[PDB]
Amino acid sequence: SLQQLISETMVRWAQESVIEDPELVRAMFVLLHRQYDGIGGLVRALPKTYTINGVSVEDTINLLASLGQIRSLLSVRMGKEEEKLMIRGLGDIMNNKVFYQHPNLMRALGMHETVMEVMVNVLGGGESKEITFPKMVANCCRFLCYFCRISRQNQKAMFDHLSYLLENSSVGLASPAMRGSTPLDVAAASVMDNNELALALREPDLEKVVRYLAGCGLQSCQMLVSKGYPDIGWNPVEGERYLDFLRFAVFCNGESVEEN
C-alpha cells in the first residue's frame, strides 16, 4: 500500500502549486515513474544481484570492503598515500579467493570499470610530457590483464575500452621494467585467443596502430637520447610492441584470421 499513498502525495504536491528548484521536480518525477513501472527496478537489479553460498562470507566481505575503499579513493585526488592505498587494495582484491570462483560477480560489480576510470584519471594531465604515477598505471594494467584473462566474457567487456586505450597505449613502453603491465598489453590480452573478438576487431584502430608503428620507425624516443644511447635513426621498442599487438590481432588459435 506504499505505492498508493506515494502516488497520491506525488500528484497532490505538483497539483497544489508550481514548484521551482528543478532538482526537486526531477526527484519527484523519478519517484513517480518508479512507483508506476515497478518491474523496472527488478529488471535493473537482477543483473546486478548475486548469490554465492552459506560458507564463504568473510572472504566476500573483505572483497567488498576493499572495493569500497577503492571507490572511496577514486573520489579523492591522486597522491602518494592515495597511490599506496590503491595498490594495496588492488593486491587484496587480486589475492581474494572469491575473485576466481565467481568471475561474473566482478562484472556485476563493475570493478573493471572502476579500475578503468582510475587509470584514465592517472593517464590524463598530459600526453607526451608526463607519465607520472607509473606504478599506479602498472597496477591497474596488470589487474585488468588478470581480470580479462580468467574469463570468456571479461574479454568482451574490455573490448569496449580497447578502442579508447589504444590512443594512450604509448605509455609505459620503451622501458624493460614493465614487460607485463601496459595499456597496449592489456589491449592485446583482451583480444587474445578469441576468434569472435578477433573478427569483431574492425578497422577504426588497426590503422591507428599502423600510424603509431610508422611514427616509431621514423622517429626515435627522446628518452633514449637523454639516457645516452647512440641515437639510431629509428626506434626498435615501440615498434616491437606494436608488432606484437598486431600479431595477437591477426593470429588466433593457430589459424590466421583472413580479414584481419
Binding site: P22, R26, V30, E196, L199, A200
Partner: protein, 181 residues
C-alpha cells in the same frame, strides 16, 4: 514536467547528457497516444490524446531536444523521435503549425544542422561486417548481436527519423515543405 524538460534541453552545453528521466518519460508520453465511425472515432480520440499534451509545450520540447543534440545518434534522440511520431500520427496540421511558428519565431539553425548531421550518419548495410558475422557463425555458435546483428545499426532509429520528417510535411503543408528546403 514539460517545462522542466524544455529548460534542461535549453541549458547551453556541449553534449546532450543521458538524462534517464527524459528517456523514461518520453516513452510513456509516446505510448500514451493511440465501419466508418469505428475508424473516425479512434482518430478523434487520437486527436484528443495528442491535444492532452501538445498544448502543454511538447511540440516545442521535442524540437528543443532534437536541436540540443547537434547531430549525435543516441538513445535520447531515439526517444524524442518516437515522441514526435506519437504526437504527429496522422495529419495534425495544428502541431505542424505550432512547430513551424516556433522555428520561425526563434531563428535557430542548430535544429536543421542537427537534422542534417543525424541523417548523414544514420546507417548503411555494410557487406564486410555481414560476411564477417557469417564467418563467425560458421566457425562457432556465437550469439547473435542485438542491434541488427551489428550490420545495420539502429534501422529503427533511421525509420523513425524519416517517418518524423514525413509527418512534419504530411498533408500538403507547403509552408513547411518550403521551409525544409
Amino acid at each position: 514536467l514539460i517545462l522542466l524538460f524544455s529548460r534542461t534541453a535549453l541549458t547551453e552545453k556541449c553534449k546532450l547528457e543521458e538524462d534517464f528521466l527524459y528517456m523514461a518519460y518520453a516513452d510513456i508520453m509516446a505510448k500514451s497516444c493511440h465501419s466508418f465511425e469505428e475508424k473516425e472515432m479512434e482518430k478523434q480520440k487520437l486527436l484528443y490524446q495528442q491535444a492532452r499534451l501538445h498544448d502543454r509545450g511538447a511540440a516545442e520540447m521535442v524540437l528543443q531536444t532534437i536541436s540540443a543534440s547537434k547531430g549525435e545518434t543516441g538513445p535520447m534522440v531515439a526517444a524524442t523521435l518516437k515522441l514526435g511520431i506519437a504526437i504527429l500520427n496522422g495529419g495534425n496540421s495544428t502541431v505542424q503549425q505550432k512547430m513551424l511558428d516556433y522555428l520561425k519565431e526563434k531563428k535557430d539553425v542548430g535544429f536543421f544542422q542537427s537534422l542534417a548531421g543525424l541523417m548523414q550518419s544514420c546507417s548503411v548495410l555494410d557487406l564486410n561486417a555481414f560476411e564477417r558475422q557469417n564467418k563467425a557463425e560458421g566457425l562457432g555458435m556465437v550469439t547473435e548481436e542485438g542491434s541488427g546483428e551489428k550490420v545495420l545499426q539502429d534501422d529503427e532509429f533511421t525509420c523513425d527519423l524519416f517517418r518524423f520528417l514525413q509527418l512534419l510535411c504530411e498533408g500538403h503543408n507547403s509552408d513547411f515543405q518550403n521551409y525544409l528546403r
